[PDB]
Each structure stands twice: as structure tokens, then as C-alpha cells.
Amino acid sequence: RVKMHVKKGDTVLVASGKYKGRVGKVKEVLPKKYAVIVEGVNIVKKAVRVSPKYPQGGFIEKEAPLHASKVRPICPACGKPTRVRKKFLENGKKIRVCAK
Amino acid sequence: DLRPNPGANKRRKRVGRGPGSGHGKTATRGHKGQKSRSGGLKDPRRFEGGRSTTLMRLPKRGMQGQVPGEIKRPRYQGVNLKDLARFEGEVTPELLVRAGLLKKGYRLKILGEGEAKPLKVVAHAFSKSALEKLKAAGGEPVLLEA
């Protein structure tokens, strides 16, 4: 429980290190590790292939899990902290001034 | 005046002695260097030699005590009238204890040397001598009774 955090799968700004200011959508979020993948961090896995099945398996540069505290959600501006206003039924996150 | 330098006024050196060292109180530590310096020594206070202490002396303290024990009975404390004379008005067993002497020992006995105040003085017993000093200056009533 409570492992949950900032945004889910959507647009986000990177206030990290080697990718500060960068922007992208989050294509995965690993709560078990409190990190998310965007489109930013990319390292070279010279590795032949991960699992013995399939001959070729790639030098893939794929995106490295980014620590969830180095990414802020964003909407009609520069990404604000998340408030939560409950509607007349449910509840959804209003940014520092707008919806969604 | 800040928390710097309230420093203990130049004498309270908590400096206990450490005899685990190489120059101060070393090796043997404190005064020892011999034997029967191990756990501890017999007494001394009273015990020792292992001969007769001085418990050769003897109890003239007859009336040492019976079985049922103490025998309750009125205890008279003397308050010297010179100290009584200090304050004024009219002194009673309560006022006396209420202010320094007595302390519920209960039995008040003005006595002794000094100079009597012309005041009234209720008590449980007066010394022959006290009786007169105050006789020639003021009034003096006896105890309640029981």
C-alpha cells in the first residue's frame, strides 16, 4: 500500500540530471522500485542476447528506469504539483490550477 | 550572556582518577602492589585482627530492650527561653513547632538561660531556673494536662 506516487502513464518533464528539461510520455512505471521510464535515459547494453532462445537479441540502447522523483507531470504550462479535487461523485487530480 | 561560558566557576573538576595507564597510577593501580588486594578486605571499621576487635568492652547499656519493645510514653523536648524570647505575642506548643523548634515531639519545656520576654508562655513544664526568670517579667501557665 501507499507505494503509489506521482503520475501514471502520460506526459512528464524530466528535472533529473543528464536529461533535465527533456520531455516525453511515460511508457512504464515500476512502483516496486519507485521509478518510471520516459524516453530520456538510454544506456548501451552491448549484451549479445538476454535469454538463450533467439539467436540475435540486440545491442539495444533502451531506456533506463528513471527514479520517479526526477519527473514531474505537466499541463497547459510547465508542470505543477498535483492537487486532488473530488468531483460530485469521484475524484481526479487538478494540477496547481487546472484539471487532469 | 550566552550558552558559551556559563562554564562551572573554576572549581569542580570532575576529574576522577584513572589508574588504567602507563604513568600516573599504573600496573598495580591505585595503592596496591601486594595481595589481599583482590575482591576486598575484611572490614575494618570494627572487625579485625581476628582476635577480639575491641568488643572486649561491655554493655552497661542495661535496659537494652524488651520483647514487645519500645514502651510508649510522653517525650519532653526543651526549648531554651532565649530562643523563645526571640519572637513575641504569646507562645504556645503549636507556635513554637510552627516556627522552628519542637517538631511535634509534642511535649514543650521552656528552660535554660537567656532573658525572658514579658509575654505569656504556655508550656508542659518549666525549669526551676526558667520559671523565675520569666516570673520576674511576665505570665506563665502550665500544660493542658493529658
Binding site: - | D1, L2, R3, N5, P6, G7, A8, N9
Partner: protein, 202 residues
């Protein structure tokens, strides 16, 4: 001494304190040691060779063995043995004589009075518990944040206000104590407070 500046909407008036003529630094060192002693929580423990988890058996015979000579792993000369005169929980507190406690409080207040830092007031215009208010309020009062201020008042709201400030230490009238007095460079208090201070000693 006597020259305490009071503060009010009617302007700056001035009082006359009965505060002691001289400050004994040692007394304050005695009173502060006492305060820091009682809050000391006894809680350090270690295990004697008795409370350690091992058994009694004699490790080995002690005669024609060539080995050293021993009883049981408990023995403090073993690694993983018992500890010697290591600490056990104990009450560090003691009863510093009352005369002394007061002398201190008086001399403390005084030391500040004689320094001019003491400042009684009543004019708390910034009411509703809201830092901003007390902030602006202290601005007028001559408290900006260049010096530490022990604020003392009955009104919990004034408390709430000053409370979160990193150069202020809130405190009720009865809370007055040398340590806190001495800590802060500047004493400032409510009249109702200064009164219940004189109540204790005046």
C-alpha cells in the same frame, strides 16, 4: 535592573523591575546543568557476563591441556563474552534546591534586562494564528530576525504564529526557564506573562 521598555498602541511606556543587582554566572551554570540533566533519558544498556546468552560449562579442563585456562564463553575476556562495568539504565536527574531555581530565573531575566534585550509588550495586533501576521508585527516591534527571540505569551494564537519561525522559540508563561532564556539572544514577553513571572519571583 529597572529600565524595562514596555510596548503598547499608546506608544512606548516604561516599567520598573525588582530584578537582582548582580548576576552569578556559576548559578546559571548550576541551573542549566540541572535542566539538561533531568531531560537526560536513561537508556543505555549492556549485558553482564550473567545476562549474556551462553552456557555455564567449563570450556575445557584447566590442567594438562596446554591451552590457557577458562570457565565459559560468558567471561568478559572472550570476544562475544559479557561486558564489564558497561552502562545500565539510570536516572540522571536530581533535585536542585528551589531557592536556586528562582535565583536563576531572576538573574537570567535580569541579565537580559541589563543588556536591554528584555522587552515586555501587550500590543499583539497580529492576532489570528498566521505567521505572516506576527512576522509583520515583529517588524514594528524591532524584532526582524537578526537575533534569536524567546517569545513568551499566554495566547496560543500568538504562539501558533511565531511558532514555526526558525529564530523564535514559543513558550507559555509557566514554561519560563533559564536554559531557554539563555539560549535566545532576546527575551520578549506578554504583560500577563511578565506578571505571572513576578508571581513566581518579584
Amino acid at each position: 535592573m529597572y529600565q524595562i521598555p514596555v510596548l503598547s498602541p499608546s506608544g512606548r511606556r516604561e516599567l520598573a523591575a525588582d530584578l537582582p543587582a548582580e548576576i552569578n554566572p556559576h548559578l546559571l551554570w548550576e541551573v542549566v546543568r540541572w535542566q539538561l540533566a533531568k531531560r537526560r533519558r536513561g537508556t543505555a544498556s549492556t549485558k553482564t557476563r550473567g545476562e549474556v546468552a551462553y552456557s555455564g560449562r567449563k570450556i575445557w579442563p584447566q590442567k594438562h591441556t596446554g591451552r590457557a585456562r577458562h570457565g565459559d564463553i560468558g567471561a568478559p575476556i572472550f570476544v562475544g563474552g559479557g561486558v564489564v562495568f558497561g552502562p545500565k539504565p539510570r536516572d540522571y536527574s536530581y533535585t536542585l534546591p528551589k531557592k536556586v531555581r528562582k535565583k536563576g530565573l531572576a538573574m537570567a531575566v535580569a541579565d537580559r534586562a541589563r543588556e536591554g534585550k528584555l522587552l515586555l509588550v501587550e500590543a499583539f495586533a497580529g492576532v489570528n494564528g498566521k505567521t505572516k501576521e506576527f512576522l509583520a508585527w515583529a517588524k514594528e516591534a524591532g524584532l526582524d530576525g537578526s537575533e534569536s527571540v524567546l517569545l513568551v505569551t499566554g495566547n496560543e494564537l500568538v504562539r501558533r504564529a511565531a511558532r514555526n519561525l526558525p529564530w523564535v522559540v514559543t513558550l507559555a508563561p509557566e514554561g519560563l526557564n533559564v536554559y531557554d532564556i539563555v539560549r535566545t539572544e532576546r527575551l520578549v514577553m506578554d504583560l500577563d506573562a511578565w506578571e505571572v513571572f513576578q508571581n513566581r519571583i518579584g
